[PDB]
Amino acid sequence: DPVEIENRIIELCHQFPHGITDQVIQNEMPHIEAQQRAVAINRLLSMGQLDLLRSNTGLLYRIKDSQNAGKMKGSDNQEKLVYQIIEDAGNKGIWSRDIRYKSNLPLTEINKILKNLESKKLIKAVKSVAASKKKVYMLYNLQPDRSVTGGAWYSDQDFESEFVEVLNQQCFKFLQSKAETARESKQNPMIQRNSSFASSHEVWKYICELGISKVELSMEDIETILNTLIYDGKVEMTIIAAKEGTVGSVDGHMKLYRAVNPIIPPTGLVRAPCGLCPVFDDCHEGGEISPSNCIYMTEWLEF
Amino acid sequence: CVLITCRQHNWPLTMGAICTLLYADLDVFSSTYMQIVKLLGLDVPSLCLAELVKTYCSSFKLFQASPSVPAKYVEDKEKMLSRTMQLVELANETWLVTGRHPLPVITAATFLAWQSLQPADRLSCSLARFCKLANVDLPYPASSRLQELLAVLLRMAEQLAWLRVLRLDKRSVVKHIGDL
Amino acid sequence: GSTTTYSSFRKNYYSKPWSNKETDMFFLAISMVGTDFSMIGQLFPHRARIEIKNKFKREEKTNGWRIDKAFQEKRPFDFDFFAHLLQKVLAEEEKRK
DNA sequence: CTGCCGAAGCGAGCACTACTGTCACACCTATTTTAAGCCCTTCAATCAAATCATCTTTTGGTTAGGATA
DNA sequence: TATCCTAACCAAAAGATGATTTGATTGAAGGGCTTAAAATAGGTGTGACGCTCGCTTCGGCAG
Numbered sequence A: 001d002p003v004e005i006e007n008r009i010i011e012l013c014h015q016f017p018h019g020i021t022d023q024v025i026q027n028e029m030p031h032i033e034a035q036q037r038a039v040a041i042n043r044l045l046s047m048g049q050l051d052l053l054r055s056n057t058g059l060l061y062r063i064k065d066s067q068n069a070g071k072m073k074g075s076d077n078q079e080k081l082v083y084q085i086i087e088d089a090g091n092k093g094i095w096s097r098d099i100r101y102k103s104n105l106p107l108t109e110i111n112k113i114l115k116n117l118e119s120k121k122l123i124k125a126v127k128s129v130a131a132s133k134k135k136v137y138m139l140y141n142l143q144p145d146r147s148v149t150g151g152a153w154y155s156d157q158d159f160e161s162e163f164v165e166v167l168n169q170q171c172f173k174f175l176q177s178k179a180e181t182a183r184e185s186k187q188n189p190m191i192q193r194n195s196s197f198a199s200s201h202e203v204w205k206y207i208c209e210l211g212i213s214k215v216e217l218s219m220e221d222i223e224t225i226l227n228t229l230i231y232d233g234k235v236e237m238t239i240i241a242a243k244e245g246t247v248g249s250v251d252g253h254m255k256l257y258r259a260v261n262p263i264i265p266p267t268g269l270v271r272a273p274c275g276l277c278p279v280f281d282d283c284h285e286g287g288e289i290s291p292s293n294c295i296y297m298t299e300w301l302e303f
Numbered sequence B: 001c002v003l004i005t006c007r008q009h010n011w012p013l014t015m016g017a018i019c020t021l022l023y024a025d026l027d028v029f030s031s032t033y034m035q036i037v038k039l040l041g042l043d044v045p046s047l048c049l050a051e052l053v054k055t056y057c058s059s060f061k062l063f064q065a066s067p068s069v070p071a072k073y074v075e076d077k078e079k080m081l082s083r084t085m086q087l088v089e090l091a092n093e094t095w096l097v098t099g100r101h102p103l104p105v106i107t108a109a110t111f112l113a114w115q116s117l118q119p120a121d122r123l124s125c126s127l128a129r130f131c132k133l134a135n136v137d138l139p140y141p142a143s144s145r146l147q148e149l150l151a152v153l154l155r156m157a158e159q160l161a162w163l164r165v166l167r168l169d170k171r172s173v174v175k176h177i178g179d180l
Numbered sequence C: 001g002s003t004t005t006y007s008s009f010r011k012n013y014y015s016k017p018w019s020n021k022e023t024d025m026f027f028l029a030i031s032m033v034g035t036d037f038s039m040i041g042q043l044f045p046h047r048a049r050i051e052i053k054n055k056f057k058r059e060e061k062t063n064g065w066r067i068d069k070a071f072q073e074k075r076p077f078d079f080d081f082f083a084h085l086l087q088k089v090l091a092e093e094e095k096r097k
Numbered sequence D: 001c002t003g004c005c006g007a008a009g010c011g012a013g014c015a016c017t018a019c020t021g022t023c024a025c026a027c028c029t030a031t032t033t034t035a036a037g038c039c040c041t042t043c044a045a046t047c048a049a050a051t052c053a054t055c056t057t058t059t060g061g062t063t064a065g066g067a068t069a
Numbered sequence E: 001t002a003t004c005c006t007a008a009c010c011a012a013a014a015g016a017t018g019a020t021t022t023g024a025t026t027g028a029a030g031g032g033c034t035t036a037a038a039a040t041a042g043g044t045g046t047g048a049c050g051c052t053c054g055c056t057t058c059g060g061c062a063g
């Protein structure tokens, strides 16, 4: 009788915090067959009396809260189901448009569901990186993901360009300062191979010692800030053992940076106005735009 | 705007017939209606009396037999509309039209005209009893218009001695309007 | 559902008439409270403020002298005693009737 | 063990979705006077149908008014 | 007589005439609000934006 099965399941789940196997139901009373108890469980999952915990000792079952089962009765069956979608999303969350689009549940009821779940301190709405004002709905107790928080650089649905640019310029300022002071030792290139490079922990300690930004400067954050300079063609990279610095930011290793000179001066070609000319394709001796008529060249004669 | 359009073509249309489709209410829509007209200052005619009666009278179900109206209620439309003209013309010159909701006048006239065409058959009826046969909902002022018009017609009735001799009253005056 | 539908002015809906003893309480209120129609609307939960203003507008047409006479015959003010006087006098009116 | 060239097969030009936030102002509070018209209960004032009490004509029927059979 | 016809008219059917009670309609009020004017005041929310020359594909032996 499923009526016996459901009450036994909830009672055993009350006394077993680790969860109960379906075999526990039959161990307490032997007349329960596997099929009927499985049928009862498969709909207790959709009633909020049961949550399934996959484990090696068979599938385990547990109950969460009184209102967890409460907000499945009648039309509220859509409420904790929306919470199931959200708790699957975890710290990332889902937009309003997406929850309507994905679950096909009526948005008019989703409004009530949202307000009640926020009141119960279960979900909260947070603005996201992916679509700015599109608010994700995500678990109240959890801190949201980087795709929602966007770190220290993401601020008020805008990007603090000045903050990252001043970090870039100041970190290269120190990188080139350390490189030049190291080379001023001018004893041996073999020791310059080590002295010229800067530790990511070292420069992070320096830049956070300055405290330019009141928002925290993270370790991997400063490392990625430095990672822009190599692709800016400005710095070099080298990896050593993890014992350097307090962090040792690599598994058994630790990686350094060093300012780099540009290999070649500005070319002759970039001194030619044609190189910079935008209508290059359209300038012809026969064309109405001509070297015999081009203003950029005439003006380039002066300065 | 649709309303004033029809008014330009002297096309008969009444106030609620529009508001029926618009979730509106008398005050809301009338106050607004005044606002645009004074804002635009465009010339627009009034509802001319005889125009609305054609469409109003034609809506009745009195012109054919039906299980709700056997023949004694059935009547010829031409006679009724004529009679209503001969009454409404009195109403205006006797000041009754001016400054009142126009439709109650039509309802009263039609009710009594229909009666007077077969008074022996129709004297026993009433306002609502007549209207619900035509599935028509009636004005409450129609009672006021009725009392007013009977008061008028008895005063006509006394003018003729061969009507005076019958000692006419509310009950009897109806079957002589064809004479008057 | 028909095109004959009537439209006329429904804003004069049937309101509850005023009692003579209720009028007497209204006058002793002018004696006792003043002309604060919101406050009077509170002492008469069955009447709202607009009803008080309409009551004043009706009374002022003929009974201004009684308005003044009540207003000069001042009495100390108590909401609780006021409410008791109302329902007791109303119950007495019903019992007499 | 690469690869050139066979046989089987398909094809076309002619057929006189949205935000979303700001913004500005519509919207309301809140009173005074007009006039007639329009408005719902609600009983007061008035009117109408059906019934009870009773008289009267005929069917039953006698007494007495009257009669054949 | 044994009974009916029918004056007189009782006894009731049935026919029917009138005053009254009971059931229904209604005047006018309660009181309520609208056009139009005068003005200052504030908020907060709403809601603009029929083929047939050309061309394709892959097995069968030479070299």
Ligand code: SF4
Pocket (backbone or CB within 6 Å): A273, A274, A275, A277, A278, A279, A280, A283, A284, A289, A290, A291, A294, A295, A296, A297
């Ligand atoms: S317009 Fe002058 S600069 Fe530009 S491509 Fe022509 S010659 Fe060169």
